[PDB]
Amino acid sequence: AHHHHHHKVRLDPSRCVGHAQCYAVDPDLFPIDDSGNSILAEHEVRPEDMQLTRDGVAACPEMALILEEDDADVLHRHQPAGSFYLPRLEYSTLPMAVDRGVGWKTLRDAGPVVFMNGWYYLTRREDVLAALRNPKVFSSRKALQPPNPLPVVPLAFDPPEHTRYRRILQPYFSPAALSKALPSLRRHTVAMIDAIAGRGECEAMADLANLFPFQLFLVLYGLPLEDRDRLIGWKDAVIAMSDRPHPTEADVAAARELLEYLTAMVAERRRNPGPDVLSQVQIGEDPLSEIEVLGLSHLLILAGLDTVTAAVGFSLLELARRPQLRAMLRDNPKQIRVFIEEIVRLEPSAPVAPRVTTEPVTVGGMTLPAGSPVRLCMAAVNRDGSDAMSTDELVMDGKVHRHWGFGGGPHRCLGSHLARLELTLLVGEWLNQIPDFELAPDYAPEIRFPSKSFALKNLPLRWS
Ligand code: HEM
Ligand code: F3S
Ligand code: NI
Ligand code: NI
Ligand code: NI
Ligand code: NI
Ligand code: NI
Ligand code: NI
DSSP: OOOOEEEEEEEEETTOOOOHHHHOOOOHOBOOOOTOBOOOOOEEOOGGHHHHHHHHHHHHTTEEEEEEOOOOOOOOOOOOOOOOOBBOGGGGGSSSSSHHHHHHHHHHHOOOOOOOEEEEEEHHHHHHHHHTTTTTTTETTTTOOOOOOOOOOTTTTTTTHHHHHHHHHHHHHHHHHHHTHHHHHHHHHHHHHHHTTTTTTHHHHIIIIITHHHHHHHHHTOGGGGHHHHHHHHHHHHHHTTTTOOOOOHHHHHHHHHHHHHHHHHHHHHHHHOOSSHHHHHHHSSSSHHHHHHHHHHHHHHSSSHHHHHHHHHHHHHHOOOOHHHHTTTEEEEHHHHHHHHHHHHSSSOOOEEEEESSSSEEEEEEEEETTTEOOHHHHHHOSSSSSSSSSSSSSSOOOOSSSTOOOOGGSSSSSSHHHHHHHHHHHHHHHHHHOOETTTTOOOOOOOSSSSBSSSEEEEEEE
């Protein structure tokens, strides 16, 4: 018994991509810099800190924190294809509409690699996590730019270009940076909840979730608040047309009007820079060009808003069904954060990441030729059952869980800190003013499937 070995924890710097989940477990044990990346220095773990240290190590989706036995001494020194049968499924008949767990289980069980409708889906954690970390082989640039001259900054870039974009942009998107915005975001969120509360009922998607992200976006980036509904309209049309081989005249015009609006905004920020993000990325040691900030602005609008909308809906749905959970969470920011992580783990708004391979690669004993289109199944991995943080159930055990709902590897969601901030604000201020509410009768929650959204079609709520 009494040979109790002590432990040390260290950071593998090549694995950290700044998820900052470790910091959420304990900010003093797991410090981060102004870009949201761990600055933990290797050290002996105090016996009283062992459980929180294990929790932080368990929270990192890149496995970048390593706990090892502190056992160095004078003797023990520490040095400083086989598969030819391709499974095929039809995407559109996966059982997704009612229960994502049943849907991803159907896909997972067909095999490590499943061909559906032109794409190779990688369904298994080993392959997905490895592929996310291997941008040389699994390229984002080859997959994620429409043949559109406006660069999709930073989504459609590989290292080293991608690395520069992340170095430049992460200081503006970190927990430290966004904390300065929180009084503003909280004030606007309180106002939105107050508009809802006095009604006694809503259809939460159309009435709140569809509006809340763009409202806060305008506040964050200093855009005119009266432009919200025009901008939502443009966003909705440009999202809808991305799937269309032959966009309508209304589609083309919507895209043109959004481009013209953002072009004028970006040019004005370059002429008269203020203490805002879109101004400041355009000056300093390594400036972004106007076209780069324009591409970034389009990406934030088209990818950072409907994702939060969808997560709002799932958050309110689950609270509506669970009265005792509502009561625990109210005025409980630490457990609200636990809850929001479970919602993103179980109902990630972008459940797969597309890539194109640059060289042959063997996955599941199967070799995929160079140039293969590949979808990495984050959502399925989040539910693969391989540990207690990976079930199909909502798990409220007081701990921050690792998951891949915000992606992983270098493209890990740039807005992940913001998404968590907005979702925890919403849940907290909803429960503050609307502690008890229920689903309207005869409601069955479903997503629209197959489609470009994994969000609830609607969410009818009622209260007194
Ligand atoms: C719950 C809400 C959100 C979820 C589930 C989500 C999910 C994701 C995922 C999985 C990726 C990686 C895609 C890939 O590897 O190809 C990603 C990338 C990205 N997301 Fe988020 N997102 C959310 C909210 C936001 C917000 C609020 C913003 C900013 C306003 C945003 C901006 C971005 C950007 C700029 C990237 C590209 C990062 C890069 O390629 O380096 N997202 N998102
Ligand atoms: S910030 Fe922390 S959660 Fe992981 S990716 Fe870096 S050690
Ligand atoms: Ni002993
Ligand atoms: Ni002894
Ligand atoms: Ni001792
Ligand atoms: Ni040990
Ligand atoms: Ni050792
Ligand atoms: Ni030993």
